[PDB]
DNA sequence: CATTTTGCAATTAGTACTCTTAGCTATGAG
RNA sequence: CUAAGAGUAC
DNA sequence: CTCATAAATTGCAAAATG
């Protein structure tokens, strides 16, 4: 009922000056802000303390003591986090990269 | 805290 | 279920539990006025078996973890006397599709 | 002693190779590479077994490379050292700090210090060899030779043998 | 020019990963580094012409690996192990997913 | 050339480790131990060895390389050194949670004080994350200040069982500045808690202990919190006038060096005290200068020294202003003008721009004889080549080169050339709160100093040509610009999933325009229907029957409009109060791809949804409502053009 | 590696080859084709490397597969040429 | 803020709808799995109408006169009147019809029957119309079990998720249960025979664009869905008794506990 | 795990730490697990020359110590091509001190040294020395003490020994 | 058993252009 | 070269 | 005479009592 209120707030924000945003992406936004059983605000003591990866939990705010913080919990960043592989500069696991492109052998013989 | 993040406490 | 009038003693509190699997659970009479399960706002809550949760988990490849979380202290979740760990399915009238359904893991 | 063990080796491959004969090439390219090598993890590697069907998988495209990193898995016989191990050999040289011995693609240098007292070098013999009371030591002289010491290099492995215990020396 | 924060987020939007990392390694900054898979710290001397890998203290030369990491991040993590952090980077899963 | 070859296996960073540094992988890692503060020897030419500058960490000149491996400044990472701190001090990073953690351990057996023995901790440990198990164990054993040698039994409140407790009770810490003083229960009991005494006591905990803590036995233990050896890092993070970090760590050993002396040449105990507070001062304004309460280290120039703690954070920091967003090559920026004459999906690039910002084609036999025409025409005249890169890495520029005659070119190599036309690149126009404000244009060549761009792709922008100006990024290699033509290009972005409506239409003049055009009272004479007809670059050839054939052939607008639209589109809107006849001819009727009826203006041609722009976008696709949008604007500016269209100030008189 | 790869048998993702999918093969095989690699379609003089791609992708001459990577790091190898292109 | 909290959700192959950690945000985007730039505005004429005005427009009767059809409308029109079977088949298709009209009037309670869906079923129909030149006086080709087994084919062709398990097929149908509503809307036997008059091959080319376009509306695995929703936010905010507007997000995005403006309803 | 450092007991024969890689059970390219089988001089000559005979024919199709060295150099010359002095060198020693000549003496060694229920690596050991007695077994080879009786060790060497031709 | 009360700093649209100034001051001593 | 500052464009 | 140093969010542990 919280994740509905918060959805019919956005809404009626959106929708105050007369623009019109399709409902999933404000669907999304609210299911993000209340994945995690309360409501998770958009704030650096929000969706920041969320433990999902030191490298991009620095990037928004607070970077210095988070990097402090992983120090000393030894945490594991798995790098499957977009801003993980863009300070590593590789091709984060998104859109393009989202899967691996590999070579059939049998099929390039079968075509001659 | 600190301030900021007095003390704890004063 | 002990329902009571006003406020439970913090002396009482603490034997409220017992020896398993007996449990104790405390509602409040004025919390209990209304039945919040009958809004429009609030979607269908359903408690599921651990088989169900045992597939659910297989089928959709989840951790425990992985899962929405839902608080054990959710007005629904006292409720339907959620325990940790068990998941409920939420059926919600969806506007891009008529239905939808969710699973929150109990925390 | 020798072992066969499961190896896997990332290969890249350019974009112009990429034909119907790339699984020769792959099957070659492991070739060169691999046969009669010789690593500080796994000691000598002799060959690979089974070359009918070896393991290639689908290999991988680099992105912005175009090489392709393939996973090639295969079985290979290996020869690795280990310590206080009793194996037979060949001489093949002699010297003042001792001799060495031909134990499959290795040699295990025997030092001067690792022989019963009777035991003594001789030069004068053409070629020089080790003489002693009752056996002498020369070039390809079959001898029994126990591994106490290996250290561990990549491109050329060394052990450490002696003759010192009872029943070693010529058979 | 800048390619700044919410640039980056609209390639993401857009969904092209590769135009991102060429944005951010090719066009700006790509830096080799040598790490060894024992610590994952970049305190690997490398001798390129003379072909010798060698990180001090792990007491290895052959479990040696080299990344293409943003010369910025190269500096980032300098400065954290100056400020006693250790950014060790593995290049293995130690965990499922 | 780039970097030379290297035989270390390739592999990308999986999984980033964290930790803390203990001091003896320190002491292991450090190529050169820096024992004197000054920064060069006494001739000013050479760096002095065993200071801050050792060439052991990496040489300081661009004609040296550096002594440790050997190599120039271009490839040398740069490789720590340590100093050896006279006594241990604190992580000005780490103090609250060095508190935290001294909060939850006996001070004198170092052990924890509430085994699972205690009612809660059961609960405590039960918690899977670390953060959450240490926040709870500190705000369980905050409050308990006995070491509790002897403790009542866990299966009744009868018998004492005791465990390994030493029986002390511990005191109630506290911070000033950047030290700890502990105020025992008198049997208070004020003392500094010395950082010796510290790290003695987290020397002491238990694996089980401050693993439970949330600790590591291999990447973190507590005791790692406590500064022995700090580490140097070399020149490359603190480039030279020195760098900020250069003094700080030259005053890190004078200060060092002032307590060592006075240890070993013996010294009142207040002397001692002041040299280790100036070094604890020292070593935290070296990692953080802007600890709240201290007064901020300022600089020789009077300024606040720059920590590393200030080069990390802010949007100026590396994270943010060097990581997240970073200055790029191959882009450009100029002011922007509209052309009614571009399609939607072209950008206009100036010569001078195009001259500049530079592709590397891969040299193929499909391409050889254009790429070797553009290497013999030269980077001075476009189109052209500005480099060559051969097989080998090296690099041939086309300036100077012409001594040594034309170049053969080989299959494999690189020519990067001048961005000719129908080259995808990125178009963008900042703030860009979106991703439409990015998007990848088709490059047309234009002779004049302006970016030119169509007026319809100017409204995702927020584009005007008041002064605006817009960016250009162009891909490097076949992979970039592959993906920027086939996700990111124009027409494919016309329709918005920000509102699954289009987020381009027609604007400005031409929507005027169109309205003026397909009143009922527009009758077109034949010339100039030719030429309309003829400015739709698709029209099939045919001229329609007019409208009008008898006494005089006229053509309405909307017939010649309705050559624009695209054959096989219905639409049909009902404005307000219109019936199946239009007597105030609004509303809109299409059937097949002509104009029934309806005065084209914004509701229908415009950035709506259900209008014309979505309805051909969805029937037809992408790049036929791109087509739409240029034969639209083509042939209403045209008539525009020839029909004129003005306002004064009678337009405002009643 | 056994355990993650899901058998053909059963794969139970779209048959259709995605935006993203379809960009990074373009993009590949124009890099490819760009260094040199075989054509196996016939060329009506086209000698752009991405309309090169494009007309190999046609056909369905494309000699990869994708492996899409599902959440919990299990993985499905669909060939390009049982995708189906259908945007 | 929206951009960094966003950044990381991504729709990935299974559908679900997930973070850098794995975490599922939604078990299908968009909780129907559709592209987001392939919706468009329909209208629900099931919903909308009155029962009487329902019933004129979809109940077909082959035994009565009151809800009876005209002969002409299709081939066998004087065949088919007091038959049982195809009775039996209007019978369970108007059954079906009423449970829709229900359904869409429980999940709109202001009973709004203009909706973003997928698939414009009203430009097919008009496309199959000019393309096979309906005349709309020719009886129509086609019969009544030809018009509901291809219905039902083709709600059982629109996959959205191509799982073979219970669960999977559960989502399948609660993620595609809204446009098949819709589609049995509009492809009504009455509908088809009266208002549209398709013939055979028209029905045929109409079932298999919708099936096409359907397939091609949903949402495309990888889809950075995060920062679309983030940037499609923040982009209206920008443009911009009660609190509203940029404040007002402010006070939702950091969820604040005291705000300018704490307004109850009560009904 | 991922233990930075690494702290291992040095690697002994006697002791039978072979190392980590080395153990009893290794998971096979297929997954599961076999049991490290070690390979003895005569057994690892067959198998080394069943390869290369596999070889030959494959690239085909797309006694005495004397002649056997003979026939050997001429079919490593026609297989393979360089890099194969390390290979011949292997395969000279096996020839030169091979204790079984064809496939049916092996399958018996290695089918009974089986039904002996031993090591591997031991078994191996058994089959590449030519011991004579029991006790001079013990002593060659530590590993065996206090293992296995020595009235059956002595026997099953008797039959080793009385299985070795030429 | 029940309240109860208190003191404040860090972080907070993007880019992009031009120009101007200044880099421990003064005093001791070899 | 760096830092600080001022003014300015959208 | 010239180098070296003097808006709005958060995030609580005390200390006192009857
Ligand atoms: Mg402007
Ligand atoms: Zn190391
Ligand atoms: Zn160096
Ligand atoms: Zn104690």
């Known amino acids: 009922a919280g994740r509905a209120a918060l959805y019919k707030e956005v809404y009626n924000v959106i929708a105050s000056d007369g623009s019109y945003v399709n409902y999933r992406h404000m669907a999304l936004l609210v299911d993000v802000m209340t994945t995690q059983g309360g409501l998770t605000s958009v704030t650096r003591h929000g969706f920041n303390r969320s433990n999902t990866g030191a490298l991009m939990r620095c990037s928004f705010e607070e970077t210095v003591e988070i990097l402090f913080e992983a120090g000393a919990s030894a945490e594991l960043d798995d790098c499957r986090g977009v801003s993980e592989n863009v300070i590593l500069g590789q091709m984060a696991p998104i859109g393009t990269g989202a899967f691996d492109v590999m070579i059939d052998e049998e099929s390039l013989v079968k075509y001659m | 805290t600190x301030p900021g993040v007095t003390x704890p406490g004063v | 279920i002990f329902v009571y009038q006003n406020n439970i003693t913090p002396s009482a509190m603490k034997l409220v539990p017992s020896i398993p699997p007996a449990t104790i659970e405390t509602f409040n009479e004025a919390a209990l006025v209304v039945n919040i399960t009958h809004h429009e706002l609030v979607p269908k809550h359903i408690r599921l078996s651990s088989d169900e949760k045992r597939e659910l988990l297989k089928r959709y490849r989840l951790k425990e973890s992985q899962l929405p979380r839902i608080q054990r202290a959710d007005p629904v979740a006292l409720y339907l006397g959620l325990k940790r760990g068990e998941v409920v399915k939420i059926i919600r009238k969806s506007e891009t599709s008529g239905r939808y359904a969710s699973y929150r893991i109990c925390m | 002693m020798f072992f066969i063990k499961d190896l896997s080796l990332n290969i890249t491959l350019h974009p112009s190779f990429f034909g119907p004969r790339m699984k020769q090439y792959l099957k070659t390219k492991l070739l060169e590479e691999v046969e009669g090598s010789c690593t500080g993890k796994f000691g000598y590697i002799l060959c690979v077994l089974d070359y009918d069907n070896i393991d290639i998988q689908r290999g991988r495209i680099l992105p912005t490379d175009g090489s392709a990193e393939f996973n090639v898995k295969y079985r290979a016989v290996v020869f690795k050292p280990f310590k206080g191990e009793v194996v037979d050999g060949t001489v093949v040289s002699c010297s003042q700090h001792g001799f060495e011995v031909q134990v499959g693609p290795m040699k295990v240098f025997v030092t001067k210090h690792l022989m019963p007292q009777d035991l003594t070098f001789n030069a004068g013999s053409n070629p020089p060899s080790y003489q002693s009371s009752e056996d002498v030591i020369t070039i390809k002289s079959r001898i029994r030779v126990k591994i106490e010491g290996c250290i561990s290099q990549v491109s050329s492995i060394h052990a450490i043998g002696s003759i010192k215990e009872d029943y070693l020396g010529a058979i | 020019l800048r390619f700044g924060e919410m640039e980056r987020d609209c390639m993401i939007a857009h969904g092209a990963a590769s135009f991102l990392k060429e944005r951010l390694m090719e066009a700006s900054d790509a830096f080799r580094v040598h790490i060894c898979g024992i610590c994952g710290l970049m305190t690997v001397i490398a001798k390129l012409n003379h072909n010798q890998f060698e990180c001090k203290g792990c007491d290895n030369k052959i479990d040696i690996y080299q990344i293409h990491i943003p010369y910025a991040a190269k500096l980032l993590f300098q400065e954290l192990m100056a400020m006693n952090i250790t950014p060790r980077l593995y290049t293995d899963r130690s965990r499922d997913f | 050339v780039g970097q030379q070859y290297s035989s270390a296996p390739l592999r990308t960073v999986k999984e980033v480790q964290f930790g803390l540094f203990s001091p003896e992988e320190v002491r292991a890692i450090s190529v050169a131990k820096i024992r004197f503060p000054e920064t060069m020897d006494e001739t000013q030419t050479r760096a002095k060895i065993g200071g801050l500058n050792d060439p052991r960490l990496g040489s300081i000149d661009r004609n040296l390389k550096c002594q440790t491996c050997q190599e120039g400044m271009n490839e040398c990472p740069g490789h720590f050194g340590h100093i050896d701190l006279a006594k241990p001090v604190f992580h000005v990073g780490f103090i609250a949670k060095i508190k935290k953690v001294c909060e939850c351990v006996c001070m004198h057996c170092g052990k924890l004080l509430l085994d699972e023995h205690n009612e809660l901790m059961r609960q405590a440990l039960a918690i899977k994350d670390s953060k959450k198990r240490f926040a709870a164990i500190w705000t369980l054993c905050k409050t308990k200040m006995v070491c509790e040698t002897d403790v009542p039994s866990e299966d009744d409140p009868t018998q004492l069982v005791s465990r390994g407790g030493c029986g002390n009770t511990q005191p109630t810490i506290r911070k000033d500045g950047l030290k700890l003083v502990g105020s025992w229960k008198k049997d208070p009991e004020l003392r500094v808690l010395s950082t010796e005494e510290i790290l003695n006591i987290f020397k002491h905990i238990s694996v089980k202990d401050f693993t439970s803590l949330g600790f590591n036995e291999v990447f973190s233990r507590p005791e790692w919190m406590i500064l022995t050896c700090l580490p140097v890092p070399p020149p490359p993070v603190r480039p030279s006038g020195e760098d900020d970090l250069t003094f700080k760590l030259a005053d890190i050993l004078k200060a060092n060096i002032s307590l060592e002396t006075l240890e070993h040449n013996g010294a009142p105990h207040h002397a001692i005290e002041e040299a280790e507070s100036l070094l604890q001062f020292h070593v935290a304004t070296y990692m953080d200068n802007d600890i709240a309460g201290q007064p901020q280290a300022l600089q020789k120039s009077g300024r606040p020294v720059k920590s590393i703690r200030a080069r990390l954070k802010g949007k100026e920091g590396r994270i943010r202003g060097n990581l997240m967003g970073k200055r790029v090559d191959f882009s450009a920026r100029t002011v922007i003008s509209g052309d009614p004459n571009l399609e939607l999906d072209q950008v206009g690039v100036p010569k001078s721009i195009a001259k500049t910002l530079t592709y590397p084609e891969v040299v193929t036999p499909y391409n050889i004889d254009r790429l070797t025409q553009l290497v013999r025409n030269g980077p001075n005249e476009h189109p052209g080549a500005k480099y060559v890169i051969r097989d080998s890495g090296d690099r041939i520029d086309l300036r100077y080169s012409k001594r040594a005659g034309d170049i053969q070119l080989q299959y494999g190599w690189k020519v990067e050339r001048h961005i000719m036309d129908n080259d995808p690149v990125l178009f963008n126009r900042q703030p860009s709160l979106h991703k439409m404000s990015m998007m990848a244009h088709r490059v047309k060549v234009i002779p004049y100093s302006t970016f030119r761009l169509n007026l319809s792709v100017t409204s995702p922008y927020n584009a005007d040509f008041d002064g605006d100006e817009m960016n250009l990024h162009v891909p490097q290699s076949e992979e970039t610009r592959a993906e920027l033509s086939q996700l990111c290009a124009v027409p494919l972005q016309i329709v918005s999933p920000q509102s699954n409506k289009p987020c381009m239409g027609i604007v400005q003049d031409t929507l005027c325009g169109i309205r003026k055009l397909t009143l009922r009272d527009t009758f077109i004479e034949l010339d100039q229907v030719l030429n309309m007809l003829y400015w739709v670059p698709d029209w099939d050839g045919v001229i329609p029957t007019p409208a009008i054939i008898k006494p005089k052939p006229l053509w309405s607008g909307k017939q010649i409009l309705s050559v624009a639209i695209p054959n096989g589109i219905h639409l049909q809107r009902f404005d307000e109060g219109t019936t199946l006849l239009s007597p105030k001819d609004n509303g809109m009727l299409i059937i097949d791809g002509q104009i029934i009826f309806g005065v084209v203006e914004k509701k229908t041609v415009g950035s709506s949804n259900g209008g014309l722009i979505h309805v051909v976008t969805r029937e037809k696709g992408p790049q036929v409502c791109a087509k739409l949008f240029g034969n639209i604007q083509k042939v209403v500016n045209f008539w525009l053009l020839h029909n004129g269209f003005s306002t004064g100030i009678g337009d405002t008189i009643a | 590696l056994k355990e993650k790869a899901i058998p053909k048998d059963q794969r139970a993702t779209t048959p259709y080859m995605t935006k993203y999918e379809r960009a990074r093969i373009l993009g590949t095989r124009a890099l490819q084709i760009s260094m040199n690699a075989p054509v196996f379609v016939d060329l009506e003089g086209e000698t752009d490397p991405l309309r090169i791609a494009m007309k190999e992708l046609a056909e369905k001459k494309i000699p990869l597969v994708i492996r899409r990577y599902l959440p919990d790091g299990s993985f499905e190898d669909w060939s390009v040429e049982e995708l189906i292109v259908d945007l | ?267 | 795990r991922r233990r930075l450092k690494k702290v291992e007991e040095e690697e002994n024969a006697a002791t039978l730490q072979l190392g980590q890689e080395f153990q009893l059970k290794q998971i096979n390219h297929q997954g599961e697990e076999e049991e490290l089988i070690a390979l003895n001089l005569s057994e690892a000559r067959l198998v080394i020359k069943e390869a290369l005979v596999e070889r030959r024919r494959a690239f085909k199709r797309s006694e005495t110590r004397e002649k056997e060295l003979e026939s050997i150099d001429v079919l490593l010359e026609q297989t393979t091509g360089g890099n194969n002095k390390d290979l011949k060198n292997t395969m000279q020693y096996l020839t030169n001190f091979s204790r079984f000549r064809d496939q049916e003496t092996v399958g018996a060694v290695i089918q009974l040294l089986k039904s002996t229920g031993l090591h591997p690596f031991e078994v191996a050991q058994l089959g590449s020395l030519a011991c004579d007695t029991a006790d001079e077994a013990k002593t060659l080879i530590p590993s065996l003490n206090n293992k296995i009786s020595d009235d059956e060790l002595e026997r099953i060497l008797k039959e080793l020994s009385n299985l070795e031709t030429l």
């Open chain 8, 1 to 267: 803020r929206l951009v960094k909290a966003l950044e990381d959700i991504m729709v990935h192959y299974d559908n679900t709808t997930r973070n850098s950690l794995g975490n599922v945000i939604q078990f299908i985007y968009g909780e129907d799995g559709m592209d987001a730039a392939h919706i468009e505005k329909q209208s629900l004429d099931t919903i909308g109408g009155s029962d009487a005005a329902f019933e004129k427009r979809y109940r077909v009767d082959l035994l009565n006169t009151d809800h009876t059809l005209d002969p002409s409308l299709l081939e066998s029109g004087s065949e088919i009147l007091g038959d049982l079977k195809l009775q039996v088949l209007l019978d369970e298709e108007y059954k079906q019809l009423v449970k829709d009209r229900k359904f869409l009037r429980e999940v709109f309670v202001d009973g709004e029957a203009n909706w973003p869906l997928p698939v414009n079923i009203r430009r097919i129909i008009q496309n199959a119309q000019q393309t096979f030149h309906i005349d709309h006086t020719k009886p129509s080709d086609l019969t009544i079990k030809d018009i509901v087994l291809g219905v039902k084919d083709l709600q059982e062709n629109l996959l959205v998720l191509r799982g073979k398990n219970e669960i999977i097929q559960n989502a399948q149908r609660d993620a595609v249960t809204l446009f098949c509503c819709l589609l049995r809307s509009r492809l009504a036997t009455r509908r088809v025979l009266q208002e549209y008059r398709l013939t055979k091959q028209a029905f045929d080319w109409v079932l298999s664009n919708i099936e096409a376009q359907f397939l091609r509306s949903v949402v495309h695995p990888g889809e950075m869905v995060g920062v679309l929703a983030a940037q499609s936010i923040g982009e209206p905010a920008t443009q911009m008794k009660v609190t509203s507007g940029v404040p007002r997000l402010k006070e939702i995005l950091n969820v604040a506990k005291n705000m300018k403006t704490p307004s109850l309803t009560v009904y």
